[PDB]
Design an enzyme around this catalytic site. Structure first.
Site, PDB file in Angstrom:
ATOM      1  N   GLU A  35       3.289  12.444  13.951  1.00 30.77           N
ATOM      2  CA  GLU A  35       2.357  12.514  12.821  1.00 30.77           C
ATOM      3  C   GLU A  35       2.122  13.957  12.430  1.00 30.77           C
ATOM      4  O   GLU A  35       2.045  14.219  11.218  1.00 30.77           O
ATOM      5  CB  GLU A  35       1.015  11.859  13.145  1.00 30.77           C
ATOM      6  N   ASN A  46      -0.564  11.136   0.342  1.00 32.19           N
ATOM      7  CA  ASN A  46       0.195   9.896   0.185  1.00 32.19           C
ATOM      8  C   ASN A  46       0.415   9.544  -1.285  1.00 32.19           C
ATOM      9  O   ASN A  46      -0.277  10.092  -2.118  1.00 32.19           O
ATOM     10  CB  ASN A  46      -0.583   8.748   0.822  1.00 32.19           C
ATOM     11  N   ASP A  48      -0.512   7.040  -3.010  1.00 29.44           N
ATOM     12  CA  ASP A  48      -1.656   6.421  -3.691  1.00 29.44           C
ATOM     13  C   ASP A  48      -2.771   7.426  -3.936  1.00 29.44           C
ATOM     14  O   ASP A  48      -3.831   7.095  -4.473  1.00 29.44           O
ATOM     15  CB  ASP A  48      -2.143   5.210  -2.895  1.00 29.44           C
ATOM     16  N   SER A  50      -4.500   9.092  -1.666  1.00 28.97           N
ATOM     17  CA  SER A  50      -5.244   9.348  -0.451  1.00 28.97           C
ATOM     18  C   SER A  50      -4.517  10.471   0.320  1.00 28.97           C
ATOM     19  O   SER A  50      -3.389  10.791  -0.089  1.00 28.97           O
ATOM     20  CB  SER A  50      -5.315   8.090   0.413  1.00 28.97           C
ATOM     21  N   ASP A  52      -3.817  12.134   4.430  1.00 21.09           N
ATOM     22  CA  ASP A  52      -3.831  12.048   5.877  1.00 21.09           C
ATOM     23  C   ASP A  52      -4.232  13.371   6.536  1.00 21.09           C
ATOM     24  O   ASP A  52      -3.744  14.428   6.087  1.00 21.09           O
ATOM     25  CB  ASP A  52      -2.494  11.631   6.468  1.00 21.09           C
ATOM     26  N   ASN A  59      -6.144   8.500   7.468  1.00 21.50           N
ATOM     27  CA  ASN A  59      -6.094   8.429   6.017  1.00 21.50           C
ATOM     28  C   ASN A  59      -7.483   8.254   5.400  1.00 21.50           C
ATOM     29  O   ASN A  59      -8.333   7.530   5.895  1.00 21.50           O
ATOM     30  CB  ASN A  59      -5.165   7.321   5.589  1.00 21.50           C
TER      31      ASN A  59
END
Length: 129
Positions: A35, A46, A48, A50, A52, A59
């Site tokens: 990650e 991301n 959409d 959002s 991380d 998220n």
């Protein structure tokens, strides 16, 4: 902060993730490796919109507030910036909530795709825990 593999293993254990929800410590270290490369300050947008955050790339769509993810929640009741701290408390406590949500560590697609079913104990190999 960029943690060393064994340093992160020890911190994670201290924060009670070893075998949390059944997931041995190697699963957690593996997840963090893919990650964030063990970097607490890692962030990734991301598609959409959002974002991380942190060592386990949690998220803003569901778990933290960053003020710029419309229609999102904030289930760990924390600012997303708390997930970037050199202190891993907010990340660990939020991850315990995530992993307890129903789908275990499959929540983390990098864990499913690169750690699940592998010899994850190699990630803590050699470490004084």
């Amino acid at each position: 902060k960029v943690f060393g593999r064994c340093e992160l293993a020890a911190a994670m254990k201290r924060h009670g993730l070893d075998n949390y929800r059944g997931y041995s410590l190697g699963n957690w270290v593996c997840a963090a490796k893919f990650e964030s490369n063990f970097n607490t300050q890692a962030t990734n947008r991301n598609t959409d919109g959002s974002t991380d955050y942190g060592i386990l790339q949690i998220n803003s769509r569901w778990w933290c507030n960053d003020g710029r993810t419309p229609g999102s929640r904030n289930l760990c009741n924390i600012p997303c910036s708390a997930l970037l701290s050199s202190d891993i408390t907010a990340s660990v406590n939020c991850a315990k909530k995530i992993v307890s949500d129903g789908n275990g560590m499959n929540a983390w697609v990098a864990w499913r795709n690169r750690c699940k079913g592998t010899d994850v104990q190699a990630w803590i190999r050699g470490c004084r825990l």
